Design a binder for this molecule. Structure first.
Ligand SMILES: [Mg+2]
Ligand SMILES: [Mg+2]
Ligand SMILES: [Mg+2]
Ligand SMILES: [Mg+2]
Ligand SMILES: [Mg+2]
Ligand SMILES: [Mg+2]
Ligand SMILES: [Mg+2]
Length: 41
RNA sequence: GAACUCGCUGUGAAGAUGCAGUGUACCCGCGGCAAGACGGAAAGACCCCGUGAACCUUUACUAUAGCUUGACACUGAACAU
């Protein structure tokens, strides 16, 4: 899955970029706590 | 099935009231007995057959519920080997 980040998650990514992350990771953690949004543009 | 429904000996799907020979016997009831009518009942239960049935068994065949194994999915993160 592709996510547009909204924060600096000290694991892997910085703000405002599209990054390939596990679908479950994005669905359960990133999206539900801000941090990221899906890459729909 | 219909009967004007005797005994014997034989013959005969091979154990005869009914065929042959022969003996006996007037016609008809009533009370009894139960030897025969292969008496009545039940399309033999025993036996065999049917490429018949049913239930039952098992290390008969084929499956399958269940139990169980792993892959993939729901399912992600960090790190160390
Ligand atoms: Mg005789
Ligand atoms: Mg006689
Ligand atoms: Mg009498
Ligand atoms: Mg009798
Ligand atoms: Mg009597
Ligand atoms: Mg009889
Ligand atoms: Mg019969």
């Amino acid at each position: 899955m592709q996510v547009i980040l909204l924060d600096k998650v000290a694991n892997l990514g910085s703000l405002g970029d599209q990054v390939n992350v596990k679908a479950g990771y994005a669905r359960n953690f990133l999206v539900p706590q801000g941090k990221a949004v899906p890459a729909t543009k």
